[PDB]
Amino acid sequence: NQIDLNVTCRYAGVFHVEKNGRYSISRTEAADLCQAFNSTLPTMDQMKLALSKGFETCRYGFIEGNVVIPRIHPNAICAANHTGVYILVTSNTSHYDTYCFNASAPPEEDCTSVTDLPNSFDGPVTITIVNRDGTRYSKKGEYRTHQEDI
Numbered sequence: 001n002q003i004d005l006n007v008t009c010r011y012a013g014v015f016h017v018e019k020n021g022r023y024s025i026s027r028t029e030a031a032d033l034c035q036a037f038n039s040t041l042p043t044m045d046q047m048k049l050a051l052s053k054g055f056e057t058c059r060y061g062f063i064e065g066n067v068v069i070p071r072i073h074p075n076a077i078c079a080a081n082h083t084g085v086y087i088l089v090t091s092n093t094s095h096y097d098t099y100c101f102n103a104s105a106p107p108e109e110d111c112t113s114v115t116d117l118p119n120s121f122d123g124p125v126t127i128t129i130v131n132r133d134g135t136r137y138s139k140k141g142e143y144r145t146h147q148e149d150i
């Protein structure tokens with residue numbers, strides 16, 4: 001009973017989280033996951049500031065209101081060569097990654113490791129935070145408040 005949460009650097013408090021390295025997070029799960037990180041779904045303005053500080057991914061993720069990919073460098077296989085906060089317009093499907101916003105993070109680029117999920121609650125799951133440099137932090141608990149997500 002095990003979940004990997006792969007996390008990125010924070011940029012102006014904004015970071016990307018993916019579950020088990022594959023698109024698998026619902027919109028309700030995304031809100032609960034950010035909450036477990038004492039974070040919220042970013043606004044578009046928070047995301048645009050993060051982009052200006054150096055944030056880009058090649059993954060669709062929830063923010064408040066939309067599914068987006070922040071892009072700095074044009075790449076034909078990421079957001080169809082767009083730059084800026086690319087907004088996903090047309091999709092059949094409902095499960096992506098998520099972005100989260102932590103107001104207490106440093107103002108610019110923070111590529112230190114994440115080593116806690118401070119607001120997860122009691123539960124049976126072995127949750128492992130996986131950083132891009134391979135650093136891991138594990139705890140037993142739960143973050144999903146919606147039965148449909150479990």
Ligand SMILES: Cc1nc[nH]c1CN1CCc2cccc(N)c2C1
Pocket residue numbers: 006007008018021022059130131132133
């Ligand atoms: C290349 C790729 N395919 C699906 N997701 C991804 C990006 N992942 C790749 C796996 C991974 C592991 C630990 C931290 C981070 N940020 C990531 C980012």
